[PDB]
Amino acid sequence: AKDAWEIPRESLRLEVKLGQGGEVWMGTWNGTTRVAIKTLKPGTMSPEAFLQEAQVMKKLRHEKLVQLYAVVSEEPIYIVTEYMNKGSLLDFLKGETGKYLRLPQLVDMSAQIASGMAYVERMNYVHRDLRAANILVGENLVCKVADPIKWTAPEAALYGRFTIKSDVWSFGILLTELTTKGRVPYPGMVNREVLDQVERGYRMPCPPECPESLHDLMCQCWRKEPEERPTFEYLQAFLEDYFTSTEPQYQPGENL
Ligand SMILES: COc1cccc(-c2cn(-c3ccc(CN4CCC(O)CC4)cc3)c3ncnc(N)c23)c1
């Protein structure tokens, strides 16, 4: 028995291909509604498993989470959502526009992600794979949460203990992506080195031109003890108010 998210497949025209991993397409829904469509390439994972993402997307509704529109829950299975016309944050950061972003833009992007994740937090959910590649960018630099040892808290990577606090860890790592225009965290380190070093207390240093106040925040996100890590509610307020309350004398530099 289907729910009120169900639509007939015939209402979808998959136009322009965007990515693969099944796939994701640009497309149209009913009359004149531009959407994104996730496909399941037969075999790779079970229907139930591909319909994890949709089922959670059904209960999560917020301005800074990518919005589910519809689902075709019989094969070939499709998930349908709003279309994010600037694609992934990671690609945006690394792209041609990426280099013009300065700290005011990057922090605002972080504030928006924190807000979506603050909502995930209030709803008692856990994301598990929070990072720039899973943030989508739209018009007016809107960032939405959608959808990785280097991004994963140690307790989670080692013991499968994923909580909102391990999401906070990942958010700290995401701040390094933002402040380096999308560089891979722990430059030159393989996953084993990162595990080994993090366990001995190593944390990434302050990125070049990143204000110390922003790095301290990263460090708080990376506290060994999950419960000592800030809430997203806290992160959202800090990042929202950053240039008044925290760094009121910020001046542009070469890159940030
Ligand atoms: C069911 O609908 C969903 C659910 C979850 C995510 C997406 C999604 C993914 N993308 C997407 C964005 C960027 C890329 C970029 N890509 C990977 C790295 C790079 O090499 C270039 C190609 C691929 C897919 C979207 N773009 C625009 N709009 C989207 N909704 C997406 C859609």
Report how far residue 162's alpha carbon sits from residue 151's, in angstroms, rounded to the nearest whole number: 12
Q: Is 91 a pocket residue for ligand 1 (Cβ < 6 Å)?
A: yes
Resolution in A: 2.3
Q: Is 166 a pocket residue for ligand 1 (Cβ < 6 Å)?
A: no
Active-site annotation holder among 129, 147, 216, 241: 129
Atom of ligand 1 nearest to the CA of 66: 30
Q: Which residues contact 31 (CB under 8 A, 6 or more apart)?
A: none
Domain spans of the chain, in order of start: 1-83, 84-249
* Exp. method: X-ray
Q: Give the CATH number of domain 84-249; options: 3.50.30.30, 2.60.40.10, 1.10.510.10, 3.40.50.300.
A: 1.10.510.10
- Indicate if 129 belongs to the active site: yes
Q: Give me ligand 1 centre to Cα 24, in Å.
A: 6
Neighbours of 124 (CB within 10 A): 7
CATH code for the structural domain at 1-83: 3.30.200.20
